[PDB]
Design a protein around this ligand. Structure first.
Ligand SMILES: NC(=O)c1ccc[n+]([C@@H]2O[C@H](COP(=O)([O-])OP(=O)(O)OC[C@H]3O[C@@H](n4cnc5c(N)ncnc54)[C@H](O)[C@@H]3O)[C@@H](O)[C@H]2O)c1
Length: 248
């Protein structure tokens, strides 16, 4: 096992109460970062803080990242809890319902874009402002393989994740002359997936050459390096976690 140092650094992790964000918070606490969990569910946040407290110092902020005003209230509350805001791992988002474009609900389309794309912009804006003021920052926007490939019957989700990738490329080059790294990750499906049929699971696994889904352990390990100081050159890039499926 590697060790990523985070002493003196503070991190914001949206969607940190469970799943990918929780696994990243668990690893950043091993690097002894100060972790602030952003999530919409106040109940899940309370269970996360209870599990993670024996691992280190953790704070929680209730916020809907698709509401820009709630994001503005969240970043100010976080400033009262930290000395600086050094790391952002944007993991909040929904999967959206599955439907062909010909049948997709306009309301569901707008809901997916607001949460998975507009929300990512709101969070990235207020956090990078602090990173600019301190001339330090590391950002990882957790996208998806769907953003690269355009999965059939998931157009809204795929379109939202592709915007997050372009947002990442744009924001990265805007801050390239500063000590700020802005990158994204395109993971495959994770072990959310239990609502699927077995035949549907066999189809998803047939597109992944490793024949298995990514473990939250493996995502958190790669995120931990991407938000460390040693990631001092690569920015506006996409790091893959698809197990051999992606071709670019
Ligand atoms: N798990 C997968 O198979 C998979 C695959 C590819 C990409 N992703 C992406 O990774 C992210 C989440 O992954 P996960 O496995 O941890 O899902 P999850 O359901 O286990 O957790 C998602 C968390 O984000 C929160 N959330 C949703 N909308 C929110 C909002 N407006 N404001 C604040 N919090 C909100 C949720 O409360 C939850 O805590 C998403 O961006 C997802 O698109 C997941």
């Amino acid at each position: 096992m590697n060790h990523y140092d985070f002493q003196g650094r503070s991190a914001i992790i949206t969607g940190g109460a469970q799943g990918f964000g929780y696994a990243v918070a668990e690893r950043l606490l091993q690097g002894k970062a100060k972790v602030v969990l952003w999530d919409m569910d106040d109940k899940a946040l309370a269970e996360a803080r209870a599990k993670l407290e024996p691992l280190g110092n953790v704070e929680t902020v209730r916020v809907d990242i698709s509401d820009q005003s709630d994001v503005q209230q969240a970043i100010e509350a976080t400033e009262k809890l930290t000395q600086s805001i050094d790391i952002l791992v944007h993991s909040a988002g929904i999967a959206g319902q599955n439907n062909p474009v010909a049948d997709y609900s306009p309301e569901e389309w707008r809901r997916v874009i607001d949460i998975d794309l507009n929300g990512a912009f709101y969070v990235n804006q207020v956090v990078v402002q602090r990173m600019i003021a301190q001339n330090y920052g590391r950002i990882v926007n957790i996208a998806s393989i769907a953003g690269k490939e355009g999965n059939p019957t998931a157009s809204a989700y795929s379109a939202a994740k592709a915007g997050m990738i372009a947002l990442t490329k744009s924001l990265g080059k805007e801050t390239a002359t500063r000590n700020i790294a802005v990158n994204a990750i395109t993971p495959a499906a994770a072990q959310i997936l239990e609502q699927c049929t077995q035949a549907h699971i066999d189809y998803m696994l047939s597109k992944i050459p490793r024949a298995r889904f990514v473990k939250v352990e493996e995502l958190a390990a790669m995120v931990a390096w991407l938000v460390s100081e040693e990631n001092s050159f690569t920015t506006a890039s996409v790091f893959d976690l698809s197990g051999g499926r992606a071709t670019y």
